[PDB]
Amino acid sequence: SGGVKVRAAVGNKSNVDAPSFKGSNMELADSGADYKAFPKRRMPGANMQGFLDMAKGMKPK
Amino acid sequence: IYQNERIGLKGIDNKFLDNNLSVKELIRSLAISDTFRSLYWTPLYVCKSIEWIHYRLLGRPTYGRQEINQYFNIAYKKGFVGVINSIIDSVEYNECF
C-alpha cells in the first residue's frame, strides 16, 4: 500500500460528463493486414508477351 | 387442387365460365399462379422445373441442350413467369393447340 486512503477517489466531479470521446487519442484497427489468399488479378505473361511488347508501340501513340 | 387453395383461383374460373376467356389465356392464368409456382417452380431444381414445366405446357420433353438452354437462359433474366410466357407464346404451342 502506497497512499493509504486508496490512492484515488478521483478528485470529485466537476464538469465530469459522458460526451467524453472514448479513445480520442488516438487511432486503432489496421486493415491492410487482413489476409486474403488471392491477389487482385492481372493478365499478361506467357501466352501473351507478344502483344505486351507490342502495345508499347502505340503506348506513347 | 384442394378447395383451400382453389379459392384464390375462383376469380379465374368463372371469368372463363361466362365465356370471357380463351383456353390459352386460361392455361397461362393457371400456370402463372402462385399455386403453381409454389408447387413446381419453387420446390424444384431450376433446370428440372424448366423441364417439368416444359412437359406440361408443351406436350413433349426438351430435345437437346440448345432448347433447354434457351428457356433456361430466360429464367436468368425474367424468372418464373417469364418462362411460362415464353412457352405459351411460343410458335409450337400456337401451332399444335
Binding site: - | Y2, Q3, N4, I7, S38, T42, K77, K78, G79, F80
Partner: protein, 160 residues
C-alpha cells in the same frame, strides 16, 4: 414465415428484395421478441384454452356430442378436443412465423376433404376454433388480442 415467402416472391421475379421487402424482414426480427412472449402465453395455457374451448363448443353445438353426433361418447370427445389442441398449436406456429404459412400447409390445405371424409361437420370444427379464440384473446392485452385472434379468424375463414 414472412422471411421465406418474401424471398420466394422476389425469387420468382428474378430480382433481389426491395426496401419494401427488406424493411420488413428488418421490422419482423425486431418484432421477434414480442412474438415469443405472445406464443409463450398460449403455450402453457392449452389446458384452459382447449378445455374451455370445447366448453363453449358443446354448449353451442350439442348435436355433435349428442348420440348420433360425430364426437359422441368418451372416445370421440377425447379426439374431439384433440383437434382443437392441434389447431391451437398451429396458431402458436403462425404467431412465431408471422404468417399463416405454417397453418396453411398444416391443417388448412385440403382440410375439407379430410373432415368430409371423416363424417365430421366442418362447420362444427369451425365453431370450435371460434370458441378457442374468445378464450385466447381474453388471456392477452388489446395489442396482443389483435394478433392472437387475428390468426384464429383466418383459420375460421379457410375452414368453410
Amino acid at each position: 414465415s414472412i422471411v421465406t415467402k418474401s424471398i420466394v416472391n422476389a425469387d420468382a421475379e428474378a430480382r433481389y428484395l426491395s426496401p419494401g421487402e427488406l424493411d420488413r424482414i428488418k421490422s419482423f426480427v425486431l418484432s421477434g421478441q414480442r412474438r415469443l412472449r405472445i406464443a409463450q402465453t398460449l403455450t402453457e395455457n392449452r389446458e384452459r384454452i382447449v378445455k374451455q374451448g370445447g366448453q363453449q363448443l358443446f354448449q353451442r353445438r350439442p348435436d355433435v356430442v349428442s348420440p348420433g353426433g360425430n364426437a359422441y361418447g368418451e372416445e370421440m370427445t377425447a379426439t374431439c378436443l384433440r383437434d382443437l389442441d392441434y389447431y391451437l398449436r398451429l396458431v402458436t406456429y403462425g404467431i412465431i412465423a408471422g404468417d399463416v404459412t405454417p397453418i396453411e400447409e398444416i391443417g388448412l390445405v385440403g382440410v375439407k376433404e379430410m373432415y368430409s371424409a371423416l363424417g365430421t361437420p366442418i362447420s362444427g370444427v369451425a365453431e370450435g376454433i371460434r370458441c378457442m379464440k374468445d378464450v385466447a384473446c381474453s388471456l392477452l392485452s388489446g395489442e396482443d388480442a389483435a394478433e392472437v385472434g387475428f390468426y384464429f379468424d383466418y383459420t375460421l375463414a379457410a375452414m368453410q
